[PDB]
Enzyme design. Structure first.
Site, PDB file in Angstrom:
ATOM      1  N   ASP A 178      -6.327  -8.312  -6.926  1.00  0.00           N
ATOM      2  CA  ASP A 178      -5.051  -7.654  -6.650  1.00  0.00           C
ATOM      3  C   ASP A 178      -5.268  -6.585  -5.601  1.00  0.00           C
ATOM      4  O   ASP A 178      -5.718  -5.494  -5.891  1.00  0.00           O
ATOM      5  CB  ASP A 178      -4.497  -7.041  -7.923  1.00  0.00           C
ATOM      6  CG  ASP A 178      -3.170  -6.362  -7.682  1.00  0.00           C
ATOM      7  OD1 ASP A 178      -2.599  -6.575  -6.588  1.00  0.00           O
ATOM      8  OD2 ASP A 178      -2.721  -5.617  -8.574  1.00  0.00           O
ATOM      9  N   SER A 223       4.923  -4.673  10.018  1.00  0.00           N
ATOM     10  CA  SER A 223       5.233  -5.907  10.732  1.00  0.00           C
ATOM     11  C   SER A 223       6.171  -5.601  11.898  1.00  0.00           C
ATOM     12  O   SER A 223       7.008  -4.688  11.790  1.00  0.00           O
ATOM     13  CB  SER A 223       5.867  -6.900   9.745  1.00  0.00           C
ATOM     14  OG  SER A 223       6.349  -8.035  10.383  1.00  0.00           O
TER      15      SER A 223
END
Ligand SMILES: COC(=O)[C@H](N)Cc1ccc(F)cc1
Length: 330
Positions: free
Chosen positions: A35, A199
């Site tokens: 994770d 992004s």
């Protein structure tokens, strides 16, 4: 030193991926969910409340010659989905894919919540976010990656998740055979403890690319792609009959649909998520309503590039003194 381990989806939907991890001496092999969004290495154990164990493999510290109680240390964690677990702490030898760390904090569960109990395939978590999120008190502990980093050939790990197929986690090297083209690196903020990056925008299907900054985290422990409501609405508007269902808890679409791809930007580069990656199948067994793999991040407080996004790429988690992320197509 390097390590290389195969990661395997736990079910036919890629709801999560499990990676075998050796703990203790002699080795006890547990299948952990790696994770990149949390920082605790915790396991089902001989200490876990018996009624909360249903099919998991447990770590038994008393059978490990190298296990030491970390006296006074406790842990308690609460994840984004409302799941949780807690317990005490041992140090022990932990190996992943041939890479060994001695003195790793292994957080032994006394309590796990229902979702953990109900998932027989996940024996615990191996957190790979920054150690600043580790929940051990009163002495915060380091992740497996942070403890390994200085033995590694290069201070990196890579995630290469499969679509309905096994993939790989590598530590200490970048397998140049595992991706196509070049790797595009992008800046990381560690301010919130995550692999947080920005992004450069998105496209829906064959549509024009929208240049827009989308801050979010690279999170292997989250199944889906959670993005701003504007972006998500633009995606599902291209699927006839898709709608946001408050009863189901997100966007659903007709199982008869063919989904468009979704592209996200990494600098000037582009990662394309095929439409089939965004299908999470019937909402309930036999239903003709299917659950979408792209969902709104509204009310989460962060955008999450979970497995739906990451499995479309070869992802480099660069733990150099100034961390960065890298993405390549594959
Ligand atoms: C805070 O929760 C997250 O998003 C973790 N990075 C992923 C995660 C989600 C659920 C769970 F049971 C364990 C881990």
């Amino acid at each position: 030193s390097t390590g290389s381990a195969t990661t395997t989806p736990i079910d036919s939907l890629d709801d999560a991926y499990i990676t075998p991890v050796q703990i203790g001496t002699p080795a006890q092999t547990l299948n952990l969910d790696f994770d990149t969004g949390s920082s605790d290495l915790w396991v089902f154990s001989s200490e876990t409340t018996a009624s909360e164990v249903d099919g998991q493999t447990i770590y038994t510290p008393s059978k490990s010659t190298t296990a030491k109680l970390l006296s006074g240390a406790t842990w308690s964690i609460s994840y984004g989905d409302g799941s949780s677990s807690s317990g005490d702490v041992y140090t022990d030898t932990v190996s992943v894919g041939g890479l060994t760390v001695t003195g790793q904090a292994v957080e032994s569960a006394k309590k796990v919540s229902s979702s953990f109990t109900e998932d027989s395939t996940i024996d615990g978590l191996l957190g790979l976010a920054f150690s600043t999120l580790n929940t051990v008190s009163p002495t915060q502990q380091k992740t497996f990656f942070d403890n390994a980093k200085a033995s590694l050939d290069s201070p990196v790990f890579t995630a290469d998740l499969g679509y309905h197929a096994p993939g790989t986690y590598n530590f200490g090297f970048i397998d140049t055979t595992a991706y196509t083209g070049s790797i595009t690196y992008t800046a990381v903020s560690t301010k919130q403890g995550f692999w947080e990056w920005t992004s450069t925008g998105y496209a829906v299907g064959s549509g024009t690319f929208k240049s827009t900054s989308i801050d979010g985290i690279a999170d292997t422990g989250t199944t889906l792609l959670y993005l701003p409501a504007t972006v998500v609405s633009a995606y599902w508007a291209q699927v006839s009959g898709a709608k946001s269902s408050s009863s189901v808890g997100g966007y659903v679409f007709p199982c008869s649909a063919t989904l468009p791809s979704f592209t996200f930007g990494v600098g000037s580069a582009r990662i394309v998520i095929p439409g089939d990656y965004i299908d999470f199948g019937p909402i309930s067994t036999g239903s003709s309503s299917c659950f979408g793999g792209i969902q709104s991040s509204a009310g989460i407080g962060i955008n999450i590039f979970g497995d739906v996004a990451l499995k479309a790429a070869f992802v480099v988690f660069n733990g150099a003194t100034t961390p960065t992320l890298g993405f390549a197509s594959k």
